[model samples]
Target: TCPFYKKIPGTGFTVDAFQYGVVEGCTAYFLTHFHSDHYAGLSKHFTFPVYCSEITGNLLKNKLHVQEQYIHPLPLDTECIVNGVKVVLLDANHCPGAVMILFYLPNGTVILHTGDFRADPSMERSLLADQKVHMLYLDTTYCSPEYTFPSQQEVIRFAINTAFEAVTLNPHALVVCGTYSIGKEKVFLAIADVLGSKVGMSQEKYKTLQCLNIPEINSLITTDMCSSLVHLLPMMQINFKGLQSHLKKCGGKYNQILAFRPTGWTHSNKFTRIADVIPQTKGNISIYGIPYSEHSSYLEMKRFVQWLKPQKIIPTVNVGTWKSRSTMEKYFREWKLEAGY
Candidate 1:
């Protein structure tokens, strides 16, 4: 069985991929996004040509270091045949490179897979309006009502304000923010915009950000160029001791220094301690708990399902197995069995 089709070792069928076999003879696989949960098994498992949006392909190759030979980049809304399967990729604004797949089978059944999507009303209204889908495989990560998430703009503002406050309090402040490199590029861009200057980026991130072509933004400095901003944007690597040293050295000259990491601020136990230490050295450090998530919130998920009005809604990815399935079942039960898988 394909890894995508197999049940997680501990989770029962109720929590798995519905035991759907990856058609053995199929020549192509459609990858909706580059998130670990969706594409983690790609390098190890299937070697067949995989089709996805260009952004997703870039992420797989540049970020995950996956080989290029196995990937076939496709633009959104274009239709192509992959090993006999007709597939279409659609923009799914859950993240920088996420996509939704519409698989058109020869048997006349069309399957729409909403791979970890959110309801970006503007994007969704224009992108998905043209499709007439049949079997819908949706993202139920937050299908339940308890998973409300703050807006991306709101979260970005919160994080930026927090950074601003920390910088203002301490002239030389080292602030570390945790977020995935590709996903949180926007937040960093926002910072650059606010600073009215360019920040340094890693070689890889610099190249990737170039392709994004963010509007009204372009002045990112790489870590190697930290010397230029030795007074303002002192550079620090993604390690604890390096950060400490950078903080100490720049504490008096610069008011605020921004560092981005994937896990430190989001899950670190010492986040508060780290924030408190900034002020002790020179300025007050405030940690922002902004919700910069890529997945759809509970409300967005529900709204998407309602809009699609699919005959059966099948979920893929993390929560789909146990929590999501139960939630869907209960929701449908209350709706007189009008929906759900």
Candidate 2:
């Protein structure tokens, strides 16, 4: 069973992929969010109803240019039935429209497809107030113990403080934080509010933010450099390999540029606190891999699985990927099992 598309047993609903759009037996299509990996390959045309959050629907139609007739937007926490299966969208806390799809099948099985999310205590409460989850399609990006980091809020503060320190010390220095084209708007938005600067991102992100109409989230278009003193861009904008070239080009405009990533992994296994700059450098640019991840930490996953207690666990990554079934099986065994694996 591929994690991308799961066929609800005894029902005709298929989750996320449009490759199964015209599959003979499936009835409805469910989309967790507009992340390209999840929805990129969608067929230009479709026959079934595509159910997703309002923002996701907007992306599908406005961004992807999908037809209006097939996009059906559902409210968060509100349950709706597709003939026999009851479905609800829960906050994923990953990106703007990301959601965890929960389906209540006719045979009394509860399927929770955690599309992509972190365990934020605030959103997790609404997801677990009452429900017996039977099958969990887990996100395995950080399913191992080697990846551990602080909360996003704490790390965001770290980022803000670090940026403030660098800028206050050197008036000419520009703050350049990296991010994916679609996600991590929350981080950049927070940075803007805290620093009184507008962040920059892809036109795709700009369209989505425009749709959101949040005036507070001031933004600029993604470019080599911009008028704004601070910028947010794809983490790949500056890497260890091309740091020299990147620094050489950008250094002409400013005294020093600060670069960081809000991710679980670092070139070094350990991490650093806010305003405490470490030695990840190629030139004048310093990169910090902040321990901010959407996926749960191993301990968080351990507790989440034990509490949910699903009958079977499916690692969301493809079989051979970093988060293999073997890794997830280890996770299952860690949660008080004697010989389950």
Candidate 3:
């Protein structure tokens, strides 16, 4: 429910923590990213400084109203020391400013904290291309083979193609793209590239994009949603009540309305094997759920864990005892991966 905390060996400092109640004694803190789950309870009044990616640090200041004095920005791929422990930050591939943290223990042990990220071949180097990993704090969010998905680029193609087809058949129809305020900037950016128009989003969403520093696609704060042919709304806006009233006005002006959600929930391994585009309709609106995700599938996780070959594999989502239906932590542990790669 909060930031994961750890005690650095031989160092008196404790890493990032969530609740204010248990934060008093740590000498230092590290923020993996600005996602709500990771940043819960952090605020402007927080006394300790939080070390994180430059973009995450800026968002904390601008959006969360955090003081600059309490935020520290670290360059990616660079190693730094905190209270005597060596630490390195790597791109998480999950969202803007998200990261995977590596703690180099003095006693020849290395601990990896993967803060909600996807696998990438680029990570091999920092993971040293070959050295053994002592321990891993993995993000097993989609730890099932059922979640197999295509690359983001491929899914973006499916989203844009689907959008074009929707409006091409009905020029009067305006397409609405649903995504998170941060991670899916690339989606809107690509959509605008094809339509030759700017993406219209709320001021709050615009604020999250500003720190990204991309020079290409134009985005404007749409206090009035009536203008743009393509409107980018938060994923929560998938529901009618959350989006309809204002979007109804946009639809009246633009004619027909359609939506596309670039996510992994579209395809089902139990029902289908390949990635696909799912057509879903709520009343008259057409919404497409595409195959895109930023987490590893069960196959990928097994591959990674076997390759890393650590003495023990620690899944990040659960740490305590027996969990029920949703969490397959117990099932995951039972896999024949005891022999590390």
Per-candidate TM vs. native? Answer: 0.72, 0.84, 0.86
The reply for model 3, stretches above 4 Å from the true place, is 1-10, 13-16, 217-227, 240-244, 264-269, 273-276, 282-284, 318-341
lDDT of each: 0.55, 0.69, 0.69
Let me know the TM-score candidate 1 reaches against the reference structure: 0.72
Q: Write the per-residue lDDT of candidate 1 for residues 121-225, one digit (tens) a residue.
A: 664575457766666766655555555555667656755665566556664554554444456566665665554446654466566655453564344544543
* Cα lDDT, model 1, residue 182: 53
**Can you write out model 2's per-residue Cα lDDT over 1-341, one digit (the tens) per residue?**
33433666777777776643366576777888777777856754665788888888877887777888888889888888876678889988777788888888787888888887776556447856687787888787777777676666777887777777777888777666676646666666666556666665556656666654355444433333555666655677657655445556664777676777766556454455444646477556777777666667766776667667777777676467554767767667777484342
Query: Which 10-residue window in model 3 sums to the lowest lDDT?
Result: 1-10
**Global Cα lDDT for candidate 2:** 0.69
Q: Report the lDDT tens digits of candidate 3 across residue range 1-341.
A: 32333544454444456565455456677788877867877888887768889988888899888899878888988879866778888888888888888888888888878888787766665644545667777787777656666667877787678767766788787777787747766676676567655677777876677776566424433434556677877788766565555456663666556776766554453565334546766665776665567677666666666656566556665455365324565545555446423
Arranged by lDDT with the best first, the candidates are 2, 3, 1
Superior by lDDT: candidate 1 or candidate 2:
2
Higher-scoring candidate on lDDT, 1 or 3: 3
